[PDB]
Amino acid sequence: STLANLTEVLFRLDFDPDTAVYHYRGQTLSRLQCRTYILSQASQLARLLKPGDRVVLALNDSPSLACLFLACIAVGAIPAVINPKSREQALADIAADCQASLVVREADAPLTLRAAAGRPLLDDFSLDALVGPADLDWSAFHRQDPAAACFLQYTAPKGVMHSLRNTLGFCRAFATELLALQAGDRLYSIPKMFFGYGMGNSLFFPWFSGASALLDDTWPSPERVLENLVAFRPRVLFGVPAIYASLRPQARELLSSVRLAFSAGSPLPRGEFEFWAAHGLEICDGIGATEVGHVFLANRPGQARADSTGLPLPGYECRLVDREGHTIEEAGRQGVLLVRGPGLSPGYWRASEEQQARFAGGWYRTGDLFERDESGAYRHCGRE
Numbered sequence: 001s002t003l004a005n006l007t008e009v010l011f012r013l014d015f016d017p018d019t020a021v022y023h024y025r026g027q028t029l030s031r032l033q034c035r036t037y038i039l040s041q042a043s044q045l046a047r048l049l050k051p052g053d054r055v056v057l058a059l060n061d062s063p064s065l066a067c068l069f070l071a072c073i074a075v076g077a078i079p080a081v082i083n084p085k086s087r088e089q090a091l092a093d094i095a096a097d098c099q100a101s102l103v104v105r106e107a108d109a110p111l112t113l114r115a116a117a118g119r120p121l122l123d124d125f126s127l128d129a130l131v132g133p134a135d136l137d138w139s140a141f142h143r144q145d146p147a148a149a150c151f152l153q154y155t156a157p158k159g160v161m162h163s164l165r166n167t168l169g170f171c172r173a174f175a176t177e178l179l180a181l182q183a184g185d186r187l188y189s190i191p192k193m194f195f196g197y198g199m200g201n202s203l204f205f206p207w208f209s210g211a212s213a214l215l216d217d218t219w220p221s222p223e224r225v226l227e228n229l230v231a232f233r234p235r236v237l238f239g240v241p242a243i244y245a246s247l248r249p250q251a252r253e254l255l256s257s258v259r260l261a262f263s264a265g266s267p268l269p270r271g272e273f274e275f276w277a278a279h280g281l282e283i284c285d286g287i288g289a290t291e292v293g294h295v296f297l298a299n300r301p302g303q304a305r306a307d308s309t310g311l312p313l314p315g316y317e318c319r320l321v322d323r324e325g326h327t328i329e330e331a332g333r334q335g336v337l338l339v340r341g342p343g344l345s346p347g348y349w350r351a352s353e354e355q356q357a358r359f360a361g362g363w364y365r366t367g368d369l370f371e372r373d374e375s376g377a378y379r380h381c382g383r384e
């Protein structure tokens, strides 16, 4: 295969550079603005990090987080985004697990750097003081095997490795094949970027499909969410079942903007589906897993059904194994869901033999019990 770099590949996708990519605190950044900032920042990270060094980013959602993440990748570093409110020992355990060279935290608290106070639109994270001002026209991307580890996603937390190949893989299946996101689409993800679901929705899909995403550094209280819906008016809403439960009293405001409502994280109850169907809003339930990059099995827009997880996305293969390890062919018979496909991770960054056994045989063992109906659609039935 030909060596490549995930940030460079995204930067080369054919979309208008003057269009929005990120929105933050009432401001908007274009693809061009972030691209310029990412290259400048990369020129500084290259003075600090050698290719392969790990970086832990314990930051609230913001354009600077997304861009710093892409700047790490540009120079060949391997970033991980974790909950900024992690306990001290939890942050330490993660940095030790990936042997990180650099941790970047919020203000006031490996080498540790801090964001500025005041929530600026763009942040230098003290790099100007640490390594000096940026180069003007940096482009020294670190290109590598497309199957090699590019960044980590931690889900005892284990670090899931994601590569250039399977990242573009899960983007294609979900953003393109399932949702058919169009350039200019406005996206709003309630889950944050330290969640695999949020990282895809907010960080990657804007670059991948020419869309733009609202980023919010505050926690998603239902009143904060409602504010954002009316200020931003997204076409696509990435939610979870409890969120839609909390949005019932505001159905009018929701349907005024949201045209594609997605739900992931846990099974969407039939009651929630039918309530919003009665109001004329289709909630598409889909399942993803960190070890699979993003959503791999979902209700297709315009064809969703209640109490169902839908059909495997294009390119994915789903299998059900019974308690003796045999593949289940019959419908209405529960088994453990195994999955392979474009988004499948190459494995955990650091793990025991038993931990890596989740990836045994070229499949990811979800640990979810599922059943298939006569048409091939899946239905969540609990955990093993």
Ligand SMILES: Nc1ccccc1C(=O)OP(=O)(O)OC[C@H]1O[C@@H](n2cnc3c(N)ncnc32)[C@H](O)[C@@H]1O
Pocket: 155, 195, 196, 197, 198, 263, 264, 265, 266, 267, 268, 285, 286, 287, 288, 289, 290, 291, 293, 294, 295, 309, 366, 367, 368, 380
């Ligand atoms: N990482 C993700 C990327 C995209 C979208 C979600 C995720 C995500 O949740 O990743 P995680 O690794 O935290 O958890 C995966 C596990 O969560 C459960 N689950 C998620 N979605 C559903 C659903 N629709 N219906 C039923 N169960 C679901 C299921 O137990 C699964 O094994």
